CSV table of C-alpha atoms and ligand atoms in Angstrom, one decimal:
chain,number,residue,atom,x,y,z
A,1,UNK,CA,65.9,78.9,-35.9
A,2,UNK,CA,67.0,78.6,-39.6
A,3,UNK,CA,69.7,76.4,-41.1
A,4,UNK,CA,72.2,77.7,-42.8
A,5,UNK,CA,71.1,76.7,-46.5
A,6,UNK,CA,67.6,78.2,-45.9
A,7,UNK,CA,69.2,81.1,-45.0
A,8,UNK,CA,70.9,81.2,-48.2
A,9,UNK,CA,67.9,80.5,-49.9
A,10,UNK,CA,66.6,83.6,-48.3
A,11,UNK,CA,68.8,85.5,-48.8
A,12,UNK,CA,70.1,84.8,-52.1
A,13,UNK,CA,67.9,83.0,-54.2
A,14,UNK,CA,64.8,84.5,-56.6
A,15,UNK,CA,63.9,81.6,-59.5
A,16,UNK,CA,60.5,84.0,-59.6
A,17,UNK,CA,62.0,86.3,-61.8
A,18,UNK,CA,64.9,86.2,-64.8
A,19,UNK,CA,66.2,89.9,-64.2
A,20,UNK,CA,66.2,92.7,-62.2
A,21,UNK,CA,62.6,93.7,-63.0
A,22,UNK,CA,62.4,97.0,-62.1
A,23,UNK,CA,64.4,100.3,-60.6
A,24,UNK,CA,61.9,99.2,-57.3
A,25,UNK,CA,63.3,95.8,-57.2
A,26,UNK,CA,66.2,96.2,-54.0
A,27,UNK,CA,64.3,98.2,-52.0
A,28,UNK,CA,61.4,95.6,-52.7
A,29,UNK,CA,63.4,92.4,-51.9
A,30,UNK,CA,65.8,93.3,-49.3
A,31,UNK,CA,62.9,94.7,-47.3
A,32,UNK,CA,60.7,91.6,-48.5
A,33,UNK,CA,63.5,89.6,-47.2
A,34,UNK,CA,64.2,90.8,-43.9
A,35,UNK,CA,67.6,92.2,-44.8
A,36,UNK,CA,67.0,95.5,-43.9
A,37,UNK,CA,65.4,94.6,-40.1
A,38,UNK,CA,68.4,95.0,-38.0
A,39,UNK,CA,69.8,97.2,-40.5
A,40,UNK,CA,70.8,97.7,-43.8
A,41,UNK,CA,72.6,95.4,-45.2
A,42,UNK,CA,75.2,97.2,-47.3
A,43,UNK,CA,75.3,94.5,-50.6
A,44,UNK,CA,73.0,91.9,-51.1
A,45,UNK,CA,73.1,89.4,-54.5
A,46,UNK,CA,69.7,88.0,-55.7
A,47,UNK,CA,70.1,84.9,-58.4
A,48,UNK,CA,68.0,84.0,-60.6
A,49,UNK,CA,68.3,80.5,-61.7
A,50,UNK,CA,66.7,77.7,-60.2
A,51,UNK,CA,67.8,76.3,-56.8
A,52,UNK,CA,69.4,72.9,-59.0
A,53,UNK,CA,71.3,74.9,-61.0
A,54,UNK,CA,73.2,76.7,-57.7
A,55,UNK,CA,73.3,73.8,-55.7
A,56,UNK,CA,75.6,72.1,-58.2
A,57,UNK,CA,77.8,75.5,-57.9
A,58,UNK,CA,79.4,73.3,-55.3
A,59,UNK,CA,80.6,71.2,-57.3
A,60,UNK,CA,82.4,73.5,-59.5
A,61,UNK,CA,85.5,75.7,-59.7
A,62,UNK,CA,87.3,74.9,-56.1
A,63,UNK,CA,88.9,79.0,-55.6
A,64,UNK,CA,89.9,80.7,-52.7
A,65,UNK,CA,87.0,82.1,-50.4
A,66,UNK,CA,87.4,85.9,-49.6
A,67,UNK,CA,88.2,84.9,-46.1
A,68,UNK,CA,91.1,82.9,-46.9
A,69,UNK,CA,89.0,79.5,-46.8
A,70,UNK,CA,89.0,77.0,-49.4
A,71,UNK,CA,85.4,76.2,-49.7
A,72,UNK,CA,84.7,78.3,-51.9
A,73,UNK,CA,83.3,77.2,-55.7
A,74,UNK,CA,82.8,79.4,-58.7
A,75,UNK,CA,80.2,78.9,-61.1
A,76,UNK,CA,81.6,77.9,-65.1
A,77,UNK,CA,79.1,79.3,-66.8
A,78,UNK,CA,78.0,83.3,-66.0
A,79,UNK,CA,74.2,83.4,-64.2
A,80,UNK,CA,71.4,85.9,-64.3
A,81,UNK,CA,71.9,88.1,-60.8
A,82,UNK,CA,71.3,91.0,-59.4
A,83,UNK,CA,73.0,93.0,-57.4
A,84,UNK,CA,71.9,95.3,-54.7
A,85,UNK,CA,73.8,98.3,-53.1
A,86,UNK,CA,73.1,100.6,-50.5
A,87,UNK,CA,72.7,104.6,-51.9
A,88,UNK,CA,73.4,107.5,-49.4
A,89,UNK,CA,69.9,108.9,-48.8
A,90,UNK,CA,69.4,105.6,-47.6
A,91,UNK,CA,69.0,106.1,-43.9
A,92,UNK,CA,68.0,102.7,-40.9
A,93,UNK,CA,65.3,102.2,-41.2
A,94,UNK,CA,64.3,103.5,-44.4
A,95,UNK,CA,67.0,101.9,-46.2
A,96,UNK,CA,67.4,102.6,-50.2
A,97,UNK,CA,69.0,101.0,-53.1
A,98,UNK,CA,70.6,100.7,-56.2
A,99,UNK,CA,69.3,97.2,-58.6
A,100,UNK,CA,71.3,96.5,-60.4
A,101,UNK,CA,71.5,93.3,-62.9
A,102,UNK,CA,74.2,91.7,-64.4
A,103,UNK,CA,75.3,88.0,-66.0
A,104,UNK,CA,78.5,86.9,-64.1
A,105,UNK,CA,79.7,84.2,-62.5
A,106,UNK,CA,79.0,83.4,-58.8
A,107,UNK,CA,81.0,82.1,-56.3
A,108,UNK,CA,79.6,80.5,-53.1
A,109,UNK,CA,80.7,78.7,-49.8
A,110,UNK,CA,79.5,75.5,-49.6
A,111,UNK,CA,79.3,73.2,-46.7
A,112,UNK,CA,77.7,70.1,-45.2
A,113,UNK,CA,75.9,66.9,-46.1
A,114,UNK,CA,74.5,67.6,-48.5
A,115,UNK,CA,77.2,70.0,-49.3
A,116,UNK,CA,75.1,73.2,-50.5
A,117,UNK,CA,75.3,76.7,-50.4
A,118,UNK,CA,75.7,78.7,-47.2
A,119,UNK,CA,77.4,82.1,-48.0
A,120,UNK,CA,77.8,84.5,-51.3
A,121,UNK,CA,81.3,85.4,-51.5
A,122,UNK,CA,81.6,87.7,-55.1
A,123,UNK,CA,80.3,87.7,-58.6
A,124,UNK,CA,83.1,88.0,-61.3
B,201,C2P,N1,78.6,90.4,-54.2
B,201,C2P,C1,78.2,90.1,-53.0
B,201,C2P,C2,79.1,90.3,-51.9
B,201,C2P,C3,78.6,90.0,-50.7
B,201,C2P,N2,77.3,89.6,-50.5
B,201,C2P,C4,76.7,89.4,-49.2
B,201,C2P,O1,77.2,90.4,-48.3
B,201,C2P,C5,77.9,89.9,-47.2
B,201,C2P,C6,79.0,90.8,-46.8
B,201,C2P,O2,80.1,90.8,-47.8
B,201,C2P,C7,78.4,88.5,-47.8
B,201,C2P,O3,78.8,87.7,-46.7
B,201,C2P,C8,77.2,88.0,-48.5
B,201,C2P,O4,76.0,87.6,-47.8
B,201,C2P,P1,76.0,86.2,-47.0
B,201,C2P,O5,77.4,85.9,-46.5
B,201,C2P,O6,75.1,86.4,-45.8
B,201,C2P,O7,75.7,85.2,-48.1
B,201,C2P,C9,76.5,89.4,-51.6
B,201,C2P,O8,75.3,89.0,-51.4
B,201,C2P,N3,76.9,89.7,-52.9
């Protein structure tokens, strides 16, 4: 199985690199990843800061979660990300993307003990 923080980590996190590297690098990662083995997955954020500095996300700006839950926590200062969206000629299973990188703020879910990361909800 895989807990829900490693999935995070997965999904979310690359320290390796400060910026979106290349035009390559969302068809590199989400593949890379496994977010594109069931299907595309339509966005995707990749941060890039070091697991410490998004773990304490958590304890942050409290805001509403997307979903209408409140445990969701907005980062104060803005983070290095990038942000992957699916293009058109992208077609299961060759899916394609747009990289895209940006400095904004994140806000997460966070949940148990410890209380980390489990979900992206928005950059802003
Ligand atoms: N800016 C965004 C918005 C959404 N997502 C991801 O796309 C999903 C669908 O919105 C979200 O739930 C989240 O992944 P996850 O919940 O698995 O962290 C993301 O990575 N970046």
């Amino acid at each position: 199985k895989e807990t829900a923080a490693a999935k995070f980590e997965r999904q979310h996190m690359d320290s390796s690199t400060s910026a979106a590297s290349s035009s390559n690098y969302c068809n590199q990662m989400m593949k890379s990843r496994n977010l594109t083995k069931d299907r595309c997955k339509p966005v995707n954020t990749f941060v890039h800061e070091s697991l410490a500095d998004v773990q304490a996300v958590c304890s942050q700006k409290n805001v509403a979660c997307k979903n209408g839950q409140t445990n969701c926590y907005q980062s104060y200062s803005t983070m290095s990300i990038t942000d992957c969206r699916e293009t058109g000629s992208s077609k299961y299973p060759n899916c394609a993307y747009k990289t895209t990188q940006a400095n904004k703020h994140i806000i997460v879910a966070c949940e148990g003990n410890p209380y980390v990361p489990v979900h992206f909800d928005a950059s802003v």
